[PDB]
Amino acid sequence: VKQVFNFNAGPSALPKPALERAQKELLNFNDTQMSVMELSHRSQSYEEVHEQAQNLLRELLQIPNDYQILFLQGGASLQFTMLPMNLLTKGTIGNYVLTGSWSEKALKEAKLLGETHIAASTKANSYQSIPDFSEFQLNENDAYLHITSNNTIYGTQYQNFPEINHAPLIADMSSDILSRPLKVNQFGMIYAGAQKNLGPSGVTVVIVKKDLLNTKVEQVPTMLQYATHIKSDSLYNTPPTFSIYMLRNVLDWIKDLGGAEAIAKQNEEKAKIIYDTIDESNGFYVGHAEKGSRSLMNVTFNLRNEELNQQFLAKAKEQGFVGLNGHRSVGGCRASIYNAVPIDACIALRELMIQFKENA
Amino acid sequence: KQVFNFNAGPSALPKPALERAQKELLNFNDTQMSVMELSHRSQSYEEVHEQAQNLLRELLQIPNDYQILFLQGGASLQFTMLPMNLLTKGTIGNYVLTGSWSEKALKEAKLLGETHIAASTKANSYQSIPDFSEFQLNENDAYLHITSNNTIYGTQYQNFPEINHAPLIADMSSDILSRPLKVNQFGMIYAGAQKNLGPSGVTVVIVKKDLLVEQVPTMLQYATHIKSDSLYNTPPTFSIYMLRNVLDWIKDLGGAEAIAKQNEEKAKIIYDTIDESNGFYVGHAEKGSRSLMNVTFNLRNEELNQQFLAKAKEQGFVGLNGHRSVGGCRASIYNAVPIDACIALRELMIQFKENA
Ligand SMILES: *Cc1c(COP(=O)(O)O)cnc(C)c1O
Ligand SMILES: *Cc1c(COP(=O)(O)O)cnc(C)c1O
Ligand SMILES: [Cl-]
Ligand SMILES: [Cl-]
Ligand SMILES: [Cl-]
Ligand SMILES: [Cl-]
Ligand SMILES: [Mg+2]
Ligand SMILES: [Mg+2]
Ligand SMILES: [Mg+2]
Ligand SMILES: [Mg+2]
């Protein structure tokens, strides 16, 4: 039929081969004559999938052996409270770097549970950049330092990560995990809802330094202890089996295209097509982020006024573009260009942007 | 290539629901995207989300003063979310123990507040549901919690107690929507979808609205999800999609009364087989408490138990091993397990007995 260009911000485009693979075996997985959705998570067929998803992640991000990979339910949002529930103990401080709305949501949940601090913030200038690591106010009693690697709503992204030695560095990487190589040992824990760059909604990937968190925290509900899930290899209660399966399939695809290093090359190229379009528009399009902080995953911009914003977005939707409206809290436009968004979608968007500009 | 899916959780699903999912997996509702590729704030997703709620409301005849929530974390997270929200100081989380899942729920409540055992058949290894006249209730109960179907022990409430001093709360994970329900008897009902309603990954919570909070984490307040119609954060969109599909299948076959007829016939096949076996197969549950959802039984000794389960597996039956905690055998016959599978099981049971 007509063209569809999927710029959805979460859940988002999946790589076709992962979907085609799921479709072909949906009724009969691994010759069992059952859907993977109909299997016991204690079955060897499911356990294979569960272990393979872990091993693919390990290999792709080169995760060290003293880290474990958890598959949890509840989304990144649940991690906002689970993290301080496990690590924010009395006398300690949950220290946050604010670089957008998701950072503020994380902070808010720690405030419910303990002492918090703000190490640095670009909130005053509306989160157009990542603050300089030299401006980080650190405390000796910090339980951790928490960052948001990619600020999904504002379109900014860490280019590199701080060296932290007084507390564990924690990162919400929901919208850029496995979009590039990562030195995992810079962190105590990384978490990401899978639905932006790793697959389907319904599972949350948590990579954790085992010894920081494999111990029982007195007074914490069993399901909310990291220890529970570490000990049981994320099989304490019933896992989201189809989501983990689809995550596996997506990881296989990333591996098949050459891994994190290759996908970073693709992601820089797609991003460049859009930012060059903005940058050659003589101010017709204005990117939210400062240039040194531009996200490779979520491109945020405005036209010169709200009327043009609306006409642009209406025209896009009529031409087959999906998900370009900015987050409801900030307006404007947002082109989400996660791993699986194809480059010809980006070229299509550029064409839209240039004809709209020329004909305005 | 014969396979009979008696898995206890996750479990068999209706073929039409899986076939429908397969067919549109790449192009949902002419959007040219998978349902998995849609934004949860899209109208496309929002209609699916609401359709799943609507079908549950219709099929269980849920009154307007109840809300239907779709949450993550399984029934296991409900074990702690419930007392987190309702077990206020000076009140008591009162539990009726009818199996090990009952025990797991009570344990989480003990973390958060005062608890109590209204009644328990544990001493007799959970062979039955206690008589309601035996319940010990308290003026300051925050709730009375029951497990409607005791998945590991094979017993099930035939009916529910009339409780007016506090909300009745029920873990219906392994029998929700296997028969008609009077939802007005309850303040809350919860169930992981993965036994009777859909794949794993979503938990259905039916809650009396006005029933349910300073200092509880945002994600763990029922009010958060009620207020946001379970769209506060990203829901498990594919699992809710599949739940919708399963609910359409149940509606199509005639609803909760029709599926009860099928379920009673399935359980009748197995229990008759056991009862007519002259003690060769022995059911764990007392007759009056027999579950229609999980049929638990053993052979006369462990070696015959093992020979049977081995023979079953060779013949294509999946999931019949009993829970590790109790051993024996367990035939899970949730909604989507077809009558033909139970007939096959019967025929295997009868042949095995003859050939022993
Ligand atoms: C979308 C998003 C979240 C929310 O994730 P849920 O799975 O919806 O809880 C949190 N952090 C970031 C950076 C996100 O982009
Ligand atoms: C299976 C089951 C549970 C556990 O559900 P999860 O989704 O695995 O947490 C709880 N209660 C009952 C009655 C069950 O059968
Ligand atoms: Cl943000
Ligand atoms: Cl977002
Ligand atoms: Cl039980
Ligand atoms: Cl069970
Ligand atoms: Mg490969
Ligand atoms: Mg193409
Ligand atoms: Mg119909
Ligand atoms: Mg008879």
PDB file of C-alpha atoms in Angstrom, chain A residues 89-197:
ATOM      1  CA  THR A  89      20.098   3.300  52.859  1.00  0.00           C
ATOM      2  CA  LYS A  90      19.843   5.502  55.928  1.00  0.00           C
ATOM      3  CA  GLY A  91      22.564   8.094  56.197  1.00  0.00           C
ATOM      4  CA  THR A  92      23.135   7.979  52.430  1.00  0.00           C
ATOM      5  CA  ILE A  93      22.169  10.170  49.507  1.00  0.00           C
ATOM      6  CA  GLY A  94      20.638   9.442  46.115  1.00  0.00           C
ATOM      7  CA  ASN A  95      22.596  11.846  43.918  1.00  0.00           C
ATOM      8  CA  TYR A  96      21.027  12.715  40.553  1.00  0.00           C
ATOM      9  CA  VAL A  97      22.204  14.512  37.440  1.00  0.00           C
ATOM     10  CA  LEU A  98      19.182  16.160  35.838  1.00  0.00           C
ATOM     11  CA  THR A  99      19.281  16.350  32.037  1.00  0.00           C
ATOM     12  CA  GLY A 100      15.582  16.018  31.285  1.00  0.00           C
ATOM     13  CA  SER A 101      12.102  14.925  32.404  1.00  0.00           C
ATOM     14  CA  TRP A 102      12.997  11.278  32.846  1.00  0.00           C
ATOM     15  CA  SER A 103      15.816  12.324  35.175  1.00  0.00           C
ATOM     16  CA  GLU A 104      13.310  14.297  37.224  1.00  0.00           C
ATOM     17  CA  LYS A 105      10.964  11.305  37.428  1.00  0.00           C
ATOM     18  CA  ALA A 106      13.788   9.108  38.739  1.00  0.00           C
ATOM     19  CA  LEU A 107      14.730  11.684  41.375  1.00  0.00           C
ATOM     20  CA  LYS A 108      11.161  12.118  42.532  1.00  0.00           C
ATOM     21  CA  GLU A 109      10.920   8.415  43.430  1.00  0.00           C
ATOM     22  CA  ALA A 110      14.142   8.463  45.446  1.00  0.00           C
ATOM     23  CA  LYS A 111      12.790  11.491  47.329  1.00  0.00           C
ATOM     24  CA  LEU A 112      10.042   9.199  48.567  1.00  0.00           C
ATOM     25  CA  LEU A 113      12.596   6.899  50.128  1.00  0.00           C
ATOM     26  CA  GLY A 114      15.613   8.817  51.308  1.00  0.00           C
ATOM     27  CA  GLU A 115      17.967  11.782  51.142  1.00  0.00           C
ATOM     28  CA  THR A 116      18.572  13.018  47.623  1.00  0.00           C
ATOM     29  CA  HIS A 117      20.952  15.520  46.037  1.00  0.00           C
ATOM     30  CA  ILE A 118      21.273  17.167  42.601  1.00  0.00           C
ATOM     31  CA  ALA A 119      24.847  16.817  41.367  1.00  0.00           C
ATOM     32  CA  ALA A 120      24.258  19.082  38.360  1.00  0.00           C
ATOM     33  CA  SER A 121      21.291  20.198  36.256  1.00  0.00           C
ATOM     34  CA  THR A 122      20.604  21.930  32.971  1.00  0.00           C
ATOM     35  CA  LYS A 123      16.979  22.424  33.960  1.00  0.00           C
ATOM     36  CA  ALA A 124      17.287  26.227  34.084  1.00  0.00           C
ATOM     37  CA  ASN A 125      18.164  26.417  30.403  1.00  0.00           C
ATOM     38  CA  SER A 126      15.443  23.873  29.532  1.00  0.00           C
ATOM     39  CA  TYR A 127      17.708  20.866  29.210  1.00  0.00           C
ATOM     40  CA  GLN A 128      19.441  21.835  25.966  1.00  0.00           C
ATOM     41  CA  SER A 129      22.743  20.284  27.012  1.00  0.00           C
ATOM     42  CA  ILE A 130      24.545  17.791  29.194  1.00  0.00           C
ATOM     43  CA  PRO A 131      26.345  19.559  32.054  1.00  0.00           C
ATOM     44  CA  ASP A 132      30.143  19.518  32.272  1.00  0.00           C
ATOM     45  CA  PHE A 133      31.356  16.708  34.536  1.00  0.00           C
ATOM     46  CA  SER A 134      33.499  19.273  36.347  1.00  0.00           C
ATOM     47  CA  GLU A 135      30.310  20.826  37.644  1.00  0.00           C
ATOM     48  CA  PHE A 136      29.238  17.647  39.428  1.00  0.00           C
ATOM     49  CA  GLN A 137      28.654  18.273  43.140  1.00  0.00           C
ATOM     50  CA  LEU A 138      29.510  14.894  44.747  1.00  0.00           C
ATOM     51  CA  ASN A 139      28.978  13.820  48.392  1.00  0.00           C
ATOM     52  CA  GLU A 140      30.988  11.361  50.483  1.00  0.00           C
ATOM     53  CA  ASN A 141      27.768   9.662  51.652  1.00  0.00           C
ATOM     54  CA  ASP A 142      26.300   9.265  48.131  1.00  0.00           C
ATOM     55  CA  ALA A 143      24.598   5.857  47.698  1.00  0.00           C
ATOM     56  CA  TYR A 144      25.101   6.218  43.937  1.00  0.00           C
ATOM     57  CA  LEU A 145      25.232   8.868  41.229  1.00  0.00           C
ATOM     58  CA  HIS A 146      22.283   8.542  38.770  1.00  0.00           C
ATOM     59  CA  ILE A 147      22.277   9.767  35.192  1.00  0.00           C
ATOM     60  CA  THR A 148      20.000   9.557  32.154  1.00  0.00           C
ATOM     61  CA  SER A 149      22.253   8.695  29.186  1.00  0.00           C
ATOM     62  CA  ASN A 150      19.705   9.749  26.551  1.00  0.00           C
ATOM     63  CA  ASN A 151      17.049  12.347  27.403  1.00  0.00           C
ATOM     64  CA  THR A 152      14.241  11.005  25.293  1.00  0.00           C
ATOM     65  CA  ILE A 153      11.983  13.994  25.522  1.00  0.00           C
ATOM     66  CA  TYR A 154      14.552  16.752  25.089  1.00  0.00           C
ATOM     67  CA  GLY A 155      16.811  15.166  22.475  1.00  0.00           C
ATOM     68  CA  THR A 156      20.126  15.341  24.305  1.00  0.00           C
ATOM     69  CA  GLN A 157      22.651  12.637  24.990  1.00  0.00           C
ATOM     70  CA  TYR A 158      25.833  11.974  26.950  1.00  0.00           C
ATOM     71  CA  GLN A 159      28.792  11.731  24.567  1.00  0.00           C
ATOM     72  CA  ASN A 160      30.840   9.939  27.180  1.00  0.00           C
ATOM     73  CA  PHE A 161      30.402   8.912  30.847  1.00  0.00           C
ATOM     74  CA  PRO A 162      32.003  10.261  34.034  1.00  0.00           C
ATOM     75  CA  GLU A 163      34.647   8.428  35.981  1.00  0.00           C
ATOM     76  CA  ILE A 164      33.111   7.986  39.431  1.00  0.00           C
ATOM     77  CA  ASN A 165      34.919   6.178  42.238  1.00  0.00           C
ATOM     78  CA  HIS A 166      33.199   7.269  45.454  1.00  0.00           C
ATOM     79  CA  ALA A 167      29.789   5.711  44.644  1.00  0.00           C
ATOM     80  CA  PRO A 168      28.343   3.495  41.937  1.00  0.00           C
ATOM     81  CA  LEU A 169      27.405   5.210  38.730  1.00  0.00           C
ATOM     82  CA  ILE A 170      23.831   4.278  37.735  1.00  0.00           C
ATOM     83  CA  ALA A 171      22.331   4.956  34.316  1.00  0.00           C
ATOM     84  CA  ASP A 172      18.839   5.023  32.832  1.00  0.00           C
ATOM     85  CA  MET A 173      19.731   3.999  29.269  1.00  0.00           C
ATOM     86  CA  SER A 174      16.177   3.249  28.090  1.00  0.00           C
ATOM     87  CA  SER A 175      16.440   5.203  24.853  1.00  0.00           C
ATOM     88  CA  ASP A 176      20.036   4.540  23.782  1.00  0.00           C
ATOM     89  CA  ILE A 177      21.113   1.166  25.180  1.00  0.00           C
ATOM     90  CA  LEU A 178      23.037  -0.867  22.602  1.00  0.00           C
ATOM     91  CA  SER A 179      22.999   1.950  20.058  1.00  0.00           C
ATOM     92  CA  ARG A 180      26.815   2.133  20.424  1.00  0.00           C
ATOM     93  CA  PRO A 181      29.732   0.504  22.282  1.00  0.00           C
ATOM     94  CA  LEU A 182      29.694   0.853  26.053  1.00  0.00           C
ATOM     95  CA  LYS A 183      32.307   0.410  28.754  1.00  0.00           C
ATOM     96  CA  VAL A 184      30.048  -1.418  31.164  1.00  0.00           C
ATOM     97  CA  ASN A 185      32.575  -1.427  33.956  1.00  0.00           C
ATOM     98  CA  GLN A 186      32.117   2.316  34.333  1.00  0.00           C
ATOM     99  CA  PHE A 187      28.814   1.441  35.983  1.00  0.00           C
ATOM    100  CA  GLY A 188      27.354  -0.289  39.037  1.00  0.00           C
ATOM    101  CA  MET A 189      24.033  -0.705  37.196  1.00  0.00           C
ATOM    102  CA  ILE A 190      22.440   0.102  33.855  1.00  0.00           C
ATOM    103  CA  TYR A 191      18.708  -0.221  33.154  1.00  0.00           C
ATOM    104  CA  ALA A 192      16.503   0.153  30.104  1.00  0.00           C
ATOM    105  CA  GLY A 193      12.877  -0.596  29.279  1.00  0.00           C
ATOM    106  CA  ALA A 194      13.279  -2.699  26.128  1.00  0.00           C
ATOM    107  CA  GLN A 195      10.619  -0.943  24.051  1.00  0.00           C
ATOM    108  CA  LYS A 196      12.768   1.834  22.681  1.00  0.00           C
ATOM    109  CA  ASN A 197      15.853   0.223  21.231  1.00  0.00           C
TER     110      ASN A 197
END
